[PDB]
């Protein structure tokens, strides 16, 4: 009822919660070590390459090889950097990334060695916003790495990280609201339980889209990989970083990818419930299979990430922020209002009045957004005048 379920959470023996934390840590490490190689190979395929396929069998060790190489590489500390913050920034990026994933439901209750415990490190009454807070703290690593490096390109990268926050933070916060509204809680276990009837992706599609866009932004992934923007700022904020400090920045980014995709699964795709083809199968939602389904959904989001990288340029961060404040925020806010009214009407028996509203509202939005797209702006044309430099005649 009142999630977190008090009969499941907060009763682990010290060793068992230690082991669950360790397992989550190792799972995130292996997930990142996978995502690296899988992303490179999938990008290769999307570009008709093979990607890494030599280092170790089938190229398995390539991510591990890169990690160990960065470990074995000289630890640079450039002069002209704020040494303390220059060394802290990777830590500030890493710690919150790992912390956020604590309240992610990787499964339902299971009886490990007699102890009935969740396949989830823990859960909080405000878990979703706790993840949001951890991710927000994580951006300080990016910004302070940019600033403390004392070089123009890292400085610009860090400023782009600040702008990135200004773009995605409010959109993400608003996107959470509709899920809270249909769930009646902020715990992730409660949000998954509330999705037994149906996944909120079908119900809260606008919220899902806004959250996913703000997500791709939050992790600094293409087409919003602006803080790095190798094509503009060379290496962005992680210029001036080498070896395990750069490796920590990138591991933090990939763990943020994993955390936000796991949240997306948790609060829009039934969390760990088996998809439809296995929904009818006995015990598909029990034992360890929920872990498989959760990882499958998370990795579909990972695929979406890689696919975005392989098929889109990167916006200018001003364009992205204009997206966030002119499309994402208005759409999320109006969706929150529409969904609230819809639920109030359904609870008041109005019935059709809600359906007429809901369908109409999006229909209106889909128009006015196109208005800001083609039908009213961003699709105009002009001319110009010549100067005194004896210009030719344009046919």
């Amino acid at each position: 009822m009142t999630h977190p379920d008090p009969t499941l959470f907060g009763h682990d023996p010290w060793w068992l919660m230690l082991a669950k934390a360790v397992a989550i840590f190792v799972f995130l490490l292996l997930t990142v070590l996978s995502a690296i190689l899988i992303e490179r190979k999938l990008l290769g395929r999307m570009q008709m390459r093979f990607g890494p396929n030599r280092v170790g069998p089938a190229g398995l060790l390539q991510s591990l090889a890169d990690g160990i190489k960065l470990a074995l590489k000289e630890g640079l500390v450039p002069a002209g950097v704020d040494k303390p913050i220059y060394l802290l920034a990777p830590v500030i990026s890493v710690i919150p990334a790992f912390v956020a994933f604590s309240v992610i439901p990787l499964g339902g209750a299971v009886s490990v060695f007699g102890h009935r415990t969740p396949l989830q490190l823990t859960d909080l009454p405000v878990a979703v916003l706790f993840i949001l807070a951890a991710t927000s703290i994580g951006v300080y690593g990016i910004v302070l790495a940019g600033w403390a490096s004392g070089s123009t390109y890292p400085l610009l990268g860090g400023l782009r990280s600040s702008a990135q926050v200004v773009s995605y933070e409010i959109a993400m916060g608003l996107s959470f609201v509709a899920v809270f509204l249909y769930a009646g809680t902020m715990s992730t276990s409660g949000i998954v339980a509330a999705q037994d009837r149906t996944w909120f992706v079908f119900l809260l599609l606008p919220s899902f889209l806004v959250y996913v866009v703000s997500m791709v932004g939050e992790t600094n992934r293409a087409p919003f990989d602006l803080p790095e923007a190798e094509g503009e700022l060379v290496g962005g904020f992680h210029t001036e970083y080498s070896s395990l400090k750069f490796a920590m920045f990138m591991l933090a980014e990939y763990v943020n990818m994993t955390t936000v995709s796991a949240l997306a699964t948790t609060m829009f795709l039934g969390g760990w419930h088996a998809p439809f083809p296995f929904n009818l199968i006995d015990g598909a939602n029990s034992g360890w299979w929920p872990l498989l389904w959760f990882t499958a959904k998370v990795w579909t989001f990972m695929f979406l990430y890689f696919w975005l990288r392989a098929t889109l340029p990167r916006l200018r961060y001003d364009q992205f922020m204009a997206l966030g404040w002119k499309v994402l925020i208005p759409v999320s806010l109006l969706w929150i209002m529409v969904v609230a009214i819809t639920r109030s009407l359904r609870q008041h028996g109005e019935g059709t009045w809600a359906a007429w509203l809901l369908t109409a509202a999006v229909v209106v939005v889909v128009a006015l957004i196109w208005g800001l797209a083609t039908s009213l702006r961003r699709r105009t044309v002009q001319p110009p005048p010549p100067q005194s430099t004896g210009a030719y005649p344009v046919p």
């Binding site: 999938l42 290769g44 395929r45 999307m46 570009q47 008709m48 390459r49 093979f50 696919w307 392989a310 098929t311 889109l312």
Partner: protein, 118 residues
């Protein structure tokens, strides 16, 4: 339909189901063109005599000064090519050779050819 702007996705997805096109070098090296300007090679007549007569025409034509040739006399006690001259020393500085092929066009005996080995 706004779908055209998304055509790129259709591309990338499609390509991740068509087979990769990479040549499998070095386990399965690709087919270089028959005409490729590979490593110069000094050839022989069927009886084994060296074709090169040491005329230095190949080195003459090299824009990069990447060929060094010293000619020397063929004699009964020691004959390397038919005729009075042969290339006793024949060096190619491959850190100056630009693979242009002018040497080949210069050579009057076909002693110098370009293989496809690279």
């Amino acid at each position: 339909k706004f779908l055209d702007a998304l055509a790129g996705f259709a591309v990338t997805l499609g390509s991740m189901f068509k087979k990769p096109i990479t040549e499998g070098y070095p386990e399965k090296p690709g087919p270089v063109a028959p005409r490729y300007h590979g490593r110069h090679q000094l050839n022989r007549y069927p009886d084994g005599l060296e074709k090169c007569i040491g005329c230095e025409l190949c080195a003459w034509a090299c824009p990069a000064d990447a060929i060094y040739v010293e000619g020397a006399d063929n004699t009964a006690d020691e004959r390397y090519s038919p005729g009075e001259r042969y290339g006793r020393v024949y060096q190619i500085n491959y850190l100056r050779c630009i693979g242009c092929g002018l040497c080949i066009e210069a050579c009057p005996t076909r002693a110098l050819t370009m293989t496809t080995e690279y």
